[PDB]
Design a protein around this ligand. Sequence first.
Ligand SMILES: COc1cc([N+](=O)[O-])cc([C@H]2N(C(=O)COc3ccc4ccc(OC)c(CC(=O)O)c4n3)[C@@H](C)c3cccc(=O)n32)c1C
Ligand SMILES: [Mg+2]
Length: 304
Amino acid sequence: QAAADRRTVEKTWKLMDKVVRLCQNPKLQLKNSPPYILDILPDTYQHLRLILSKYDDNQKLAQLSENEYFKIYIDSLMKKSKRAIRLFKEGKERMYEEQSQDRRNLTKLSLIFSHMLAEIKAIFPNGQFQGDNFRITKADAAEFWRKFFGDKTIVPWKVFRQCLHEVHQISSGLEAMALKSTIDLTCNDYISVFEFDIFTRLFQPWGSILRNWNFLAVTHPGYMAFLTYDEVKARLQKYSTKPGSYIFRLSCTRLGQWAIGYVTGDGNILQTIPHNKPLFQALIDGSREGFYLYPDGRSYNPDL
Ligand SMILES: COc1cc([N+](=O)[O-])cc([C@H]2N(C(=O)COc3ccc4ccc(OC)c(CC(=O)O)c4n3)[C@@H](C)c3cccc(=O)n32)c1C
Ligand SMILES: [Mg+2]
């Protein structure tokens, strides 16, 4: 990780600007729906401009430029922005085909950028680095983080995996690789305390977290990962005549929280946020009551 001096941070601004120009192409017919690069990248430049404003003398810039998280962040942003630029160049006319693999990769990158924005606003609230004070929401998860990493804001994946394995054993590399793609929202091969917080909130309780993660995100056909409210309604339309069809999903706008969509006996699509109980438990309760019967339309619910 190169040092994050103002020259480097500015070089990243120019790259993001290219991505914004490329995404303004009308032939693209880009829909205003989260994650929306034309919101995320400008807001990211703004937050970076804020951070740099605070580190105004030369002993502050030495702090910021040497900040391990910030060094990693700026390097990711530059790599992801170069990737996006490469995507349009190599994708050429295939970028206007709203269903092409080139546009799907652009959507993948827009999620990442969105996750990176939420992270930096969390780690640098109001441009001031607060990474070592970040309060992990689940207490037993926070015990784990402080025990093995203490004050750190960001941790190499390999380090994180070995320490997690001491407490919750991973069965295989394929599992570890699926776990990585789940926890590592920003796809930078690191685990920040923000990503850890999102993960242990989604798949609580900590004491059985890997079982919960497998049950919800690996083996459950009802899991849909990131969808907007409208996208949930759209996907369930084909099942509006099959009450009990349901899916559950995440929101890139409100990380760390689950939502469920399901079809009522009348053929209506309702969506609900399970406040104050783990998702696997809401699904188990929901199944018994007769609401959550056919995950994504299949004919049986996965075995608890
Ligand atoms: C039971 O009533 C609801 C259930 C859901 N619903 O299940 O989607 C959504 C809505 C409500 N909205 C919100 O409440 C937004 O505030 C939150 C707060 C926490 C959230 C946690 C997770 C989550 O999903 C991962 C969402 C929804 C999202 O981010 O998309 C959250 N939204 C937004 C979206 C919206 C858009 C269009 C119609 C609509 O009614 N609403 C209501 C009342
Ligand atoms: Mg990461």
